[PDB]
Symmetry: D2
Subunit: 210 residues, 4 copies
């Protein structure tokens, strides 16, 4: 019965693909040690619909741990977000064409929530699997940071602050790098098999700790 | 009688110079339009002594606004920190040779404080002065972030949450860039005169807004 | 009578300004030690017209040294080009809207020409003036590299291979950095006064050596 | 009977591994469609021994095409070098602890040689295989560039200028990225399987064109 909720995002901006969606799709139903199972879902790149869908998932799936994933095109290695900040500030439109500027996510809620995943255990599991990675201390202020803040806040407000919950940003895959215009700098990337394996290793470390 | 407290840091790591120290030194005593005066101080690159020195400054000077500055070697343009995070995590030792790993700054305090400077007013004043700049959403977790969190927390706990307070990270100056080893990538830099002028423009925008 | 020919380029692409043009304009007529004078000219960002104009300048001005300058938006520090390659390969159109792909500049001419400026003397003069800088080993294959190859070839073919000749790429100035779209990474930049001073220091080192 | 000579380099600097060595080792003896076979060798990261070993290989194997490979720690994607420059200028010591400063490789030889591989055919084959990549216009001036210049010069001087010959720089693999010190910026990297596959695809495109 213990469920790890794994989310990814749909493609956005000029990206034809989203490696976080591909990773979540491949890992859905994965049996992890200790009776744990992965339940995957895809979130839209739009904060209002994504929050609504994530609230339903958190309520209906009642997960023992939450691993939110997303694309960070430009980063060379998988990273774990240390903190979700309660602000929406979009450098590019979301998939509804909307932008927010210095917008508080919630009136009268914390300025931030620290991720509650076992960060150092994941890093060590990654290194053990020969996967380079690190902790990131800003998730941006786009939809990825939004769902990290949204999940941590919902969990805390429903007395489930003990449920380990965090964010895993993944590099571009080959498809994302190949779609970059010729006049722009080339992107660091990883084969999707590498990205999916990093998300799997992280999922396995989370449930082993929990 | 209204005082803008302006701080910089001493040199650290392999840096022979700190442009934030040079800027604070040059701007000390600057008369600003609203009857405001700059009061400058230099902080050590060590969290305990820096916090102790900053508390004394906040207490003794009772400033109408607080502008903390520091070096961000590698950034190309002046930036304003949006958020101070209540964690110390040092990638390099401080000037006492100490490191911290995932250390909370304060038990039973907020995970973060948002800066209360007029961020968009400063950006606009910078642009008017032909200075490129932006908002940063992570100050790191070294001593610069520490004093941002510390100042915002002290102000809040002493009923002075309304005092605008934030952090301005500055690029390397020429001296910092010239000291980079020949095998390492070259640093973006600005002449100290450009750095100091950006700090001045920001201070002027802060007090104009009050 | 000894003349240092100093060239810059007009604005191109999305750049409103070109710091190499501003530097050449400010330094025109500068008297250097040993009877040397700077003669400046502005070249169009189009290889056919630029080569024609540079040939006329080389023929008519009969310079004792040639310092070609241009913008390298993205580089943090002034650099000296070590080599001009005999190929035109444009990642962006020139100012006539033209592109070239793997195009040899000259049939049956050298694959490249090494710059003949006193590279290490300039670097040392820069460091003496507290200016960070280095040698670059690719000028790109756009119009800047083209005029470097064109000048070195013309000089060699007219028995003037001994005339020191090279290329100085300069960072963005403030105007170039300010015009970058908000969704793109920020550019390293230098105040124009810093750029112009670096070109001046280089010009002074060249003629002092010659 | 037609032989593609494939070379890689031993580990150097602080790198525990060299993905170019791993790729050449795995691909040795590969049968290619046109009756072509890969012959692999590993070169030392030292110009004199590397040149001596490469001359012997060019002489003894008499290859129909030459693919030189090496590590470019920091680049995000495989690249093809357009040009080898006749200069040694080492930012780090070679494996004998030696450095060169502005050193011509050969007196009375061309300043550079353009690579004679079918560059656009390789790029297209890479893209078909979903591998991001590009042409590079500087190989550096370390030992990789040296062997590119050396091979192109030897071939030309022995009447074998028609033999397609060039350089393929590869990103860090996981092992190289994992060995980066914690205080330094993280490296873009690729799994060795991705690197080796890119080298294979390039070799296949070279021999398909002949």
């Amino acid at each position: 019965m213990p469920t790890l909720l794994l989310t990814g995002f749909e493609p956005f901006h000029t990206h034809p693909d989203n490696p976080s969606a591909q990773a979540a799709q491949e890992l859905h139903g994965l049996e992890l040690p200790g009776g744990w199972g992965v339940h995957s879902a895809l979130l839209p790149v739009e904060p209002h619909a994504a929050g609504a869908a994530l609230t339903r998932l958190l309520s209906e799936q009642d997960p023992g741990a939450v691993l939110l994933t997303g694309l960070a095109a430009g980063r060379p290695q998988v990273t774990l977000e240390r903190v979700g900040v309660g602000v929406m500030d979009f450098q590019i439109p979301d998939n509804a064409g909307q932008t927010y500027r210095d917008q508080p996510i919630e009136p009268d809620a914390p300025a931030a929530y620290l991720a509650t995943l076992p960060l150092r255990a994941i890093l060590a599991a990654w290194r053990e699997a020969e996967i380079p990675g690190d902790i990131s201390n800003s998730a941006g202020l786009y939809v990825c940071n939004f769902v990290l803040y949204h999940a941590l806040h919902w969990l805390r407000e429903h007395g489930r602050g003990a449920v380990p919950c965090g964010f895993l940003h993944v590099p571009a895959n080959a498809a994302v790098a190949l779609a970059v215009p010729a006049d722009r700098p080339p992107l660091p990337y990883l084969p999707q098999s590498e990205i999916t394996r990093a998300v799997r290793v992280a999922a396995e470390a989370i449930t082993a700790q929990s």
